[PDB]
Structure formats: C-alpha cells, structure tokens
Amino acid sequence: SAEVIDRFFKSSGAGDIETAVECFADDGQWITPDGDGLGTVHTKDQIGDLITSMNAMREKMIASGVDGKFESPIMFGENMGLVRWTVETDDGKVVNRGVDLFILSDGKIVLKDVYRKVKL
Amino acid sequence: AEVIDRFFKSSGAGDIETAVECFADDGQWITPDGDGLGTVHTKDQIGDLITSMNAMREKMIASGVDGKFESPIMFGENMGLVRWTVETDDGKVVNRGVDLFILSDGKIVLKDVYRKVKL
C-alpha cells in the first residue's frame, strides 16, 4: 500500500531523517538517476546522509527559482508504486521530468529506483 | 504480459507492421531523451521509430556493443517493467535503464523509456 511511500516523502521532506531511513527494508536500496550511466546504489546505512544532502541542495534550488514537485504514488498492486516528478520554474514551466519507482515488501521499501528524462 | 512479449519479438525481427499494431490507437512511446522531457511518438510514428532503432543496433553490434532486455515483470495486470542494459560482448554493462509499459484492453497504451544518466 502507498502508506510507507507517503511516510517517506513526508518525513524526509521535513528533515526527520530517522523515520525516513526506517521506511527502508534492512536490505533496501536507493538508486540515483545518474551514477555515470549505471546509477549509484545507496544502502540503508547511507540513505540518511543522502536525504540530508538532497534537502540542502533543494534549498539552494528554490532560492534560485526552480522547484521539484512530485505527484501522489500510483500503485500497481500492493507492492509497487510509481511517483512522477517534475522540475519547474516558479510559474509552472516544466524543465525536467522523471519517475521514482518504489518496490515494496512487507510494508518497507525494498527499492527506490530514480530516473530522469535526459537533458542537453 | 503477452502483448509485451509479442512486441519485442516482432520489432526485434524487423516486423514493424505487427509491432505497431501492439499499440492502442491512442497509445504512445516516449523516448528517454528529448531535452529533459522525453520525445512522444504516437502509433503513426512508431513504425519509423523501430526501423531507425534496428538500423542503429546493427552499427552497435558491428562496433561490439549489444543491448539486452529482461522478461517483463508485471505489477498488477496493466503494468510491466522491462529492465535493459547496454553491454559489451564481454559482459561489462556500460548503461542501464527501464521500459515502463502501461496496457489497456490488451494493447500498449504507454511505452515510457528511461536510462541512467552519464556526466
């Protein structure tokens, strides 16, 4: 169900990194969209730092007039959710689009696999 | 999963007409690039799309790099996830991605392609 995905976005977006990390299964992984064409794997032990650096960047992004937005999860069965996201200017021009793929098991996130459409 | 299986076999063998017919009339194929948004192709344009993809894959193989794909993983009934790689003939993966397939009434409504990004 979508509830663990929701908890993850609410807690990580408020800097509650402890409960955000605990949304992941002990062997869960978070795979970024870049990683030199392969994606960088982060294990549960590294997701707290990743969230922290990501929030710091998002602050500098917003001050510069671009914001990330994400939609509510679209569930396919109980154990898979798709989060569509955008980067857009403060007036609504979308400049980048992507998806987060969430694979769940027993109410924990086993995989958060991030993709972006590719820019210039 | 059947329409996805049919799609890869027919397009991968140059049968573009039956491959195009795997798509719903309002279906779409969205590329992974297209200046950060993805380029949308409708059913009318998917035939030319496959043909140019097959022509590229010929030059890829001659140059010693090959694309590979995993069998679809269904989540629910109307969504299939196909993981793919680009790898040398030696097994080293140089790029990874996914195709997201959305189905309705046995046709492909969305084929949404994503790749992991290089510098």
Spatial distance between the Cα atoms of A99 and A44, rounded to a whole number of angstroms:
21
| Documented resolution in Å | 2.1
Residues from chain B that touch A117, judged by Cβ atoms under 8 A, are 32-34, 36-38, 114
User: Could you tell me if B98 and B114 are in contact, meaning their C-beta atoms sit under 8 angstroms apart?
Assistant: yes
User: Could you tell me if B98 and B14 are in contact, meaning their C-beta atoms sit under 8 angstroms apart?
Assistant: no
Q: CATH for B2-115?
A: 3.10.450.50
Q: Which residue of chain A has the CA closest to B32?
A: A117
Spatial distance between the Cα atoms of A40 and A43, rounded to a whole number of angstroms:
10
Every domain of chain A and the residues it spans: 3-116
User: Could you tell me if A6 and A73 are in contact, meaning their C-beta atoms sit under 8 angstroms apart?
Assistant: yes
> If you ran DSSP here, which 8-state letter would residue A56 be given?
H
Spatial distance between the Cα atoms of B6 and A104, rounded to a whole number of angstroms:
28
State the architecture of A3-116 in CATH terms.
Answer: Roll (3.10)
Spatial distance between the Cα atoms of B99 and B72, rounded to a whole number of angstroms:
9
Map residue B119 onto helix, strand or coil: coil
Map residue B54 onto helix, strand or coil: helix
User: Could you tell me if A69 and A83 are in contact, meaning their C-beta atoms sit under 8 angstroms apart?
Assistant: no
What's the Cα-to-Cα distance from B17 to each of A30, A115, B7, B85, B111, rounded to whole Å? Answer: 39, 30, 11, 26, 17
CA dihedral A38, A39, A42, A47 (to 10 degrees): 170
Interior/surface letters B69-98, b for 16+ CB within 10 angstroms, e for the rest: eeebebbeeebbbbebbbbeeeeeeebbbb
Spatial distance between the Cα atoms of B61 and B43, rounded to a whole number of angstroms:
27
Q: B52 is written with which tokens?
A: 């140019």
**A98–B114 CB contact, under 8 Å:** yes
**B36–A77 CB contact, under 8 Å:** no
> If you ran DSSP here, which 8-state letter would residue A117 be given?
-
